[PDB]
């Protein structure tokens, strides 16, 4: 059972950047681990949207608006080892929670963090501070305030001079 097609061309508009990225889903007291889910992510000026044409589960096709984003940075990892197969993760704080996305390469991470900052620079939703560590629910991260969206423990340079 469970064998038929359901493909329709729901194409996104003018893309800035697309890549096969890993979404670490933030679990909370339910039947979910810290799932590393490698999907196709496309960034547009209106929305960051991922792709999962699952021919098995009615899996959650979520999306983030650029205006929902409050902070984008690289994840300066406090741990020894990066858990996922992909390494050099970046973080996207938004209306709900702080999302964590592992890039295949530090090349991918660099360009993604960059382009996201270049979009969210015009938002009035941006916290002047961000969280450097892994915001996992009720865990011992940077400020140990991981419950609800704290306004950042380290200072966020929205316009950071990468210039050498
Ligand atoms: Zn913190």
The domains found in the chain, sorted by start residue, are 1-164 (2.30.29.30)
What's the gap in Å between 35 CA and the centre of ligand 1?
Answer: 22
Q: Which positions make up the binding site?
A: 131, 142-143, 153
What's the gap in Å between 142 CA and the centre of ligand 1?
Answer: 4
- With tokens 């620079």, the residue in question is 121
> What span, in angstroms and rounded, lies between the C-alpha atoms of 21 and 29?
25
> What span, in angstroms and rounded, lies between the C-alpha atoms of 151 and 145?
10
What's the gap in Å between 57 CA and the centre of ligand 1?
Answer: 35
> What span, in angstroms and rounded, lies between the C-alpha atoms of 36 and 33?
9
Quickly count: other Cβ atoms within 10 Å of residue 102's Cβ.
23
What's the gap in Å between 98 CA and the centre of ligand 1?
Answer: 11
Quickly count: other Cβ atoms within 10 Å of residue 19's Cβ.
18
What's the gap in Å between 15 CA and the centre of ligand 1?
Answer: 32
**Cα-only R_g, the chain:** 16
> What span, in angstroms and rounded, lies between the C-alpha atoms of 135 and 91?
9
Give me the sign of the Cα torsion angle 121, 123, 126, 128.
positive
How many CA atoms does the CB half-sphere of 92 hold within 13 Å?
31
């Amino acid at each position: 059972m469970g064998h038929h097609h359901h493909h329709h061309s729901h194409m996104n508009f003018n893309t800035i950047l697309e890549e096969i990225l890993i979404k670490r889903s933030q679990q909370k007291k339910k039947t979910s681990p810290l799932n590393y889910k490698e999907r196709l992510f496309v960034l547009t000026k209106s929305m960051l949207t991922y792709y999962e044409g699952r021919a098995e589960k009615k899996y959650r096709k979520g999306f983030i608006d650029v205006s929902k984003i409050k902070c984008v940075e690289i994840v300066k990892n406090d741990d020894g080892v990066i858990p996922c197969q992909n390494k050099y993760p970046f973080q996207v704080v938004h209306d709900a929670n702080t999302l964590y996305i592992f890039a295949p390469s530090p090349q991918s991470r660099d360009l993604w963090v960059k382009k996201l900052k270049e979009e969210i620079k015009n938002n009035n939703n941006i916290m002047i501070k961000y969280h450097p560590k892994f915001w996992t629910d009720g865990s011992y991260q940077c400020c140990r305030q991981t419950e609800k969206l704290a306004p950042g423990c380290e200072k966020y340079n929205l316009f950071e001079s990468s210039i050498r």
